[PDB]
Design a binder for these strands. Structure first.
Ligand SMILES: [Mn+2]
Ligand SMILES: [Mn+2]
Ligand SMILES: [Mn+2]
Ligand SMILES: [Mn+2]
Lengths: 335, 334
DNA sequence: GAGTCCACCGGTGGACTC
DNA sequence: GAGTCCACCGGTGGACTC
């Protein structure tokens, strides 16, 4: 559970344990002795808790401490079972922490999407826990989907074929002269739910935890939407970075710039909203970096590439910021 | 020296050791116990060896073990001196192995400039080690400076003020909109040697090795050209990245784009040349990533990044840069 | 000395394929 | 299980300000 528990932990099967001893069955070409089982970790620590949608103690807790709990629980497990034999590299803890930050934050934005959708579809505004009721007038045509995008994803595969053919035509044009414009992905995309699904129920059900099924439910979600989204219906893009360094700033800025070149400049959509979430910005230089104008719009004919760098204090605040974003962004979508 | 020597290690002053025990002088907030003294490590390993300008064995040696040599020598020192206590985080090795890649590569490029420059200026073509006498026609006006740029640098600071005013006016434009266009820096720039220096001997001398004074010479070199470089006179920008990860590819792509927008777009420079050197592209496909078109081009066309180079040996890096200079300075009326 | 910033990258856990 | 790929980031050594 969120708070470590020796019993909860002995209840776990060997393959469900947050630490996976691989000393005697090793990743070839790696010294890795113990594996941080991040899915197992999300399961144990957040099996019953979606921060922002849980106890007041957790929703109001410093988000850094929320995101860090999985690794602390795993570290405890490892110490119980292996005592001073327990060694994980800091890069292990780095990788897992980054992935937890993204997944949990996505999960919180998922539940926000549920509650908002439920409201848009003329049901109630739920209220355990309580969040100031959104003011925008409901309509099922402005439900949103929260898509944590997978490793390797190409966000272009979200777009309706007609939009994809526009980009493909444009890139084939470049490829003849040995040039390109590859797209990768933000970590997460909030998109306007396709009509065809506006009556589907999964998009309105808040999950209770990041149990393996719900992890799957969440990380598979993008599949349901591939090929179905209009250019102007990609509402928000997010990059998660648990901490920043000056060198680790650029992937979102670059990708936001390309999203704009393509969605705005080639497909006539409105401002592409792309933001960066961090728990540890390490000075103020990132905030200045992200004041950069969108390059495409500059050199042609104007706003910033990255709308904001957000440092969520608590899960509740991330939930609040997103509702607020939806209330405000979804009034470009007609009821 | 390059090959580890217990002798040479014991004759080092305590402040010159490659490993610095900081267990009882612990760094504010860090559990680090021993530091990889990278400047000492370079003094030691490459004190008398600039790869590509040393023995043919080192020149033709696989660049990864060249660049890996200082860390290996440091671990040797730490284990001999602190036995079972010597522990160093992976991330320390990571950091130092990175700066070493960059510093040493910039030192190879420095010596190529020195030979190049010495040719341009009439003194003929040095010949140990052997490289292909560039074919282009010598001229003091086609000399170059190789500027390893320091952490925190703003490459605009290299431009002549007239060029810098154009940019600041452009950003005042934007600042009024709640906008900016911040510039950072490539890891290194090659600029046309300013006329006022084209007779200075220091730009024609090849360093024997990365002694500390030589490190400071190379790392300080940019101060001297600050404010003197015309936009078109930024010949090459290089980002060094010892290895790649798909997320670690974008700073130089982005900055290439910003440079291209500023220099080509607002200052009328030619195509700005910007490459990325790596020793380890595998597991990514950065080659595809770096085929991206310049976003300026597209708006108002060429690649942002001219190439991902993977130098197999220091000799090849020397060779490629001679090849490059020989071609790129057709543009300069010498 | 004490504190802050800068930019370095390699060891990761999981998706994917046989 | 063995191999590849993908995108995670935190622990660094040195320059800096005071
Ligand atoms: Mn994702
Ligand atoms: Mn991320
Ligand atoms: Mn540099
Ligand atoms: Mn670099």
């Amino acid at each position: 559970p969120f708070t470590y528990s020796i019993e909860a932990t002995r209840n776990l099967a060997t393959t469900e344990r947050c630490i996976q001893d691989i000393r005697n069955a090793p990743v070839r070409n790696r010294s890795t002795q113990f594996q941080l089982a991040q899915q197992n970790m999300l399961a144990y620590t957040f099996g019953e808790v979606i921060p922002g949608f849980a106890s007041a103690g957790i929703n109001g807790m410093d988000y850094r401490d929320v995101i860090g709990r999985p690794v602390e629980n795993a570290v405890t497990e490892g110490t119980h079972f292996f005592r001073d034999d327990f060694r994980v590299d800091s890069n292990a803890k780095a990788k897992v922490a980054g992935d937890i930050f993204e997944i949990v934050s996505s999960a919180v934005m998922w539940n926000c999407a549920a509650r908002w959708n439920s409201l848009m579809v003329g049901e109630g505004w739920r209220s355990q826990p309580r969040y100031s009721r959104p003011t925008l007038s409901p309509s099922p045509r402005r439900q949103v989907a929260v898509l944590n995008l997978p490793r390797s994803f190409d966000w272009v595969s979200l777009l309706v074929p007609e939009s994809q053919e526009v980009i493909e035509e444009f890139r084939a044009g470049l490829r003849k002269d040995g040039l390109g414009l590859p797209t990768s992905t933000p970590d997460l995309a909030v998109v306007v739910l396709p009509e065809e699904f506006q009556n589907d129920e999964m998009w309105r059900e808040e999950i209770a935890g990041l149990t393996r099924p719900n992890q799957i439910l969440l990380s598979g979600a993008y599949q349901r939407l591939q090929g179905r989204v209009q250019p102007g219906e990609i509402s928000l893009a997010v990059a998660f970075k648990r901490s920043l360094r000056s060198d680790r700033l650029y992937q979102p800025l670059y990708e936001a710039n390309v999203m704009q070149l393509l969605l705005e400049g080639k497909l006539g959509a409105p401002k592409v909203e792309f933001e960066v979430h961090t728990l540890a910005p390490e000075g103020t230089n990132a905030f200045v970096t992200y004041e950069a104008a969108s390059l495409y719009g500059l050199a042609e004919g104007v706003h910033r590439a990255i709308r904001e760098l957000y440092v969520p204090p608590t899960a509740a605040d991330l939930a609040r910021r997103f509702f607020a974003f939806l209330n405000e962004r979804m009034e470009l979508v007609n009821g």
